[PDB]
Amino acid sequence: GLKVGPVPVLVMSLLFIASVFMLHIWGKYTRS
Amino acid sequence: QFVEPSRQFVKDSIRLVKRCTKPDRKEFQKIAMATAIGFAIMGFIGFFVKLIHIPINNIIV
Amino acid sequence: XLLXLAX
Amino acid sequence: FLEVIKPFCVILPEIQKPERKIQFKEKVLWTAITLFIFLVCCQIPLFGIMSSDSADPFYWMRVILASNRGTLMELGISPIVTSGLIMQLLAGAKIIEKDRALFNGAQKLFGMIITIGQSIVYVMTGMYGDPSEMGAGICLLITIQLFVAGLIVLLLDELLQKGYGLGSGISLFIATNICETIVWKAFSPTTVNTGRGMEFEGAIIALFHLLATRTDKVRALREAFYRQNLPNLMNLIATIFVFAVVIYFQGFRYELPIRSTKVRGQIGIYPIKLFYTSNIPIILQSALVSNLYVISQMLSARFSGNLLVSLLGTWSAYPVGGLCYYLSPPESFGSVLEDPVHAVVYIVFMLGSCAFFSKTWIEVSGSSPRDIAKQFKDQGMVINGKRETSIYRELKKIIPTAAAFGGLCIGALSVLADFLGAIGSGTGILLAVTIIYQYFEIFVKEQSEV
C-alpha cells in the first residue's frame, strides 16, 4: 500500500496527538 | 532419587561458572556506562515528557 | 486477553 | 478469497525499507524519536472517558504490555503481539505462505481487526464509565482512537524493525516504561501533604527538601533513607546495586574457540552467554503470574465464596492467601520474618519456574545443542580442539546447563531485587537492564563491523 518513510510516520503520530488534543478542546468548549 | 540429579546440576553449574569468562574492570566499566546512558536516555525522556504533560493534561482536562 | 491472546 | 482481501490487505500504511545501511547515530536518534512519540502518547488521555475511578482490570499486565490506563496507549504493545501471533498462527496453519507483500499486509489487516475487537472488549470491561451511559458515539470514538493508536504503534515497531531503529517496539517500550517509572520515583516533584506537611515523592528531591526544611539534619537523613510512605533513597541504592549485579552476570559468557572448515582462515569465537535466554524466563514467569492475578481477581469479584476460587488466591489490591499469594513477592523483610514458609515457597517457585522456562524456551525457539550443532555443520564451523563429530557433545555439555543456570540466576536476581525492595521491582529491573544490554550488544556488533 502507501509505503511511507520515518518522517511521515512522525508527522502522522503528531497529527493524531493534535487530533486528540483538538477533540479535548472542542469537548471543553462545547460542554462549558 | 532427585538428590543425585540436583548434585549433578550443581557440579555442572560450578564447572560452567568457573570456566565462563567473567568481565574485568574495563569490560564492566564499559557495560555499566552504556547501561547507565541508555537508562538515563529512556528514563529522563519519560520523566520530562510526563512533567510537561501534567500541566497540559490539567489544561485540556 | 491475556498474555498473549489479543491482549 | 486472497484476491478479494488483497485491497483490504494493501490499504494500510507500510514503512519503506531504508535501502541503505543507517548509521548507528541516526538509528539512535530515530529510536529516541520513537520512544518520545510513545511516551507522549502514553500521557495523553482518551477522549470520552466518563469516569476513570474504577479499579484497573488489567493492572498487572501494564508493565508487561507497556500500557498506561486511560491514555492513548491503553493497549500498549498489544497490536505488535497480536500481529506477530496471528502471522505465526496463519503461517503454521499453512493457510498462506511477490507473495511477501500480501503476507506482510495481511497481518496488519488481521492484526488491527483483532485490535479493534480488543478495544471493544476493553471498553466493555466497565472502565471508562458505564458503556450504556457513554452512548454508542463516545464508545465508537474511543474505539477509533485506540485503533489509530494501535496503528501508530505498529508503524513505530515496523520502523524500528525495518531499519530506522535499534531493535523491536516491544522491548523498547517495555524498558522505556520501566525506566520512566524508576526515574519518576527518584525525581518526581509530586508533594503529598499528610501529617507533618509537604513531602516530595521523588527520593532525591525528598532528600534535598528534608535537609532544607527540617532543623535536625540527621533525622532528615534517616527519614530520607527510610521513608515508607513514598520511595526512599535506600530503594534507589538497592536499584543501583541490582543494576550492577545484573550487569556483572550479564557479562558472563562461555567462549567456544570455533574454526571454519569450508573456507580456511575464518577463525573466531562463539560466545555461549550465561543468560542464554535473555530475560525470556522473566517475561514468561511475569506473564504467568499476571495471568493468574487477572483470572483470580475476575473469579473473586464474581464467584467469590467458592472453594476453588478462594484457593486460587484471596485478595484484600494484593493477595493475602492462596496460589496468587505464594506466587507474589513479599511486601518487606518484616513479611519475610513473619512468614518464612511463604518466602521459601516464593523463592523455590521463582528459581524453578525461571529455570524450567529457560530450558523449555531453548527447546522451543531452537537454540538447543542440536540446532547449534546443525548450524555448525551448515557453516562448516568446528571447535579448535575438538573433532567434527563431538560438536553436539560439547554443545550438550555447555548449552543445556548454561540455559538452566542462567534461568536460575536471573530468577535469583529477581528475588534479590524483590527482597531489597528496589525501585522498579525485580521483573522490571531485569527486563530494563537486559533490554539495554541488547542495545549495547547491537552497538558493539556494529562497531566491530565498522
> Backbone phi, then psi, for B21, in 5-degree steps?
-95, 100
Determine, yes or no, domain membership for D162. Answer: yes
Going by C-alpha positions, the residue among A24, B58, A21 that lies closest to residue D41 is A21
Taking contacts as CB-CB distances below 8 angstroms, the residues of chain B near A25 are 60
Contact A17 D40 (CB under 8 A): yes
CB D433 within 8 A of CB D278: no
What is the span of the domain harbouring residue D309? 1-186+233-449
Determine, yes or no, domain membership for D409. Answer: yes
Q: Could you tell me whether strands D253-256 and D270-273 are parallel, antiparallel, or unpaired per DSSP bridges?
A: antiparallel
CA torsion D187-D191-D194-D199 (nearest 10°) is 50
Going by C-alpha positions, the residue among D283, D383, B60 that lies closest to residue A31 is B60
The cell for A15 is 497529527
Determine, yes or no, domain membership for D208. Answer: no
Cα dist. D64→B47, B53, D60, D207, D319 in Å?
19, 23, 8, 31, 19
DSSP string, D251-302: S-EEEE-EEESSSTT----EEEESSSSSSHHHHHHHHHHHHHHHHHHHHHHH
DSSP string, B2-37: -HHHHHHHHHHHHHHHHHSB---HHHHHHHHHHHHH
- For D40, which residue in chain B has the nearest alpha carbon? B49
Q: How far is Cα D220 from Cα D105, in angstroms, rounded to an integer? A: 59
Q: Name residue D314's beta-bridge partners.
A: D321
> Backbone phi, then psi, for D202, in 5-degree steps?
-60, 130
The count of structural domains within chain D is 1
Determine, yes or no, domain membership for D55. Answer: yes
Q: How far is Cα D450 from Cα D443, in angstroms, rounded to an integer? A: 10
Q: Where are the beta strands (DSSP E) in D349-434?
A: 381-383
The count of structural domains within chain B is 1
Is some CB atom of chain A closer than 8 A to the CB atom of D155?
Answer: yes
Q: Name residue D14's beta-bridge partners.
A: A3
The cell for D269 is 569465537
Determine, yes or no, domain membership for D197. Answer: no
| Angle between the N-to-C axes of helices D233-250 and D217-226, in degrees from 0 to 180, rounded to the nearest 10 | 50
Residue with cell 570456566: B19
Determine, yes or no, domain membership for D312. Answer: yes
| Burial letters D379-397, b for 16+ CB under 10 A, else e | eebbbeeeeeeebbebbbe
Q: How many residues does chain A have?
A: 32
Q: What is the DSSP letter of D192?
A: E
Is some CB atom of chain D closer than 8 A to the CB atom of B51?
Answer: yes
What is the span of the domain harbouring residue B33? 1-61
| D255/chain B closest Cα distance in angstroms | 7
Going by C-alpha positions, the residue among D131, D147, D148, D130 that lies closest to residue D139 is D131
Q: How far is Cα B54 from Cα C3, in angstroms, rounded to an integer? A: 30
Among D252, D356, D445, which would you mutate to test the B interface (most chain B Cβ atoms within 10 Å of its Cβ)?
D252
Cα D112 from chain centroid?
Answer: 21
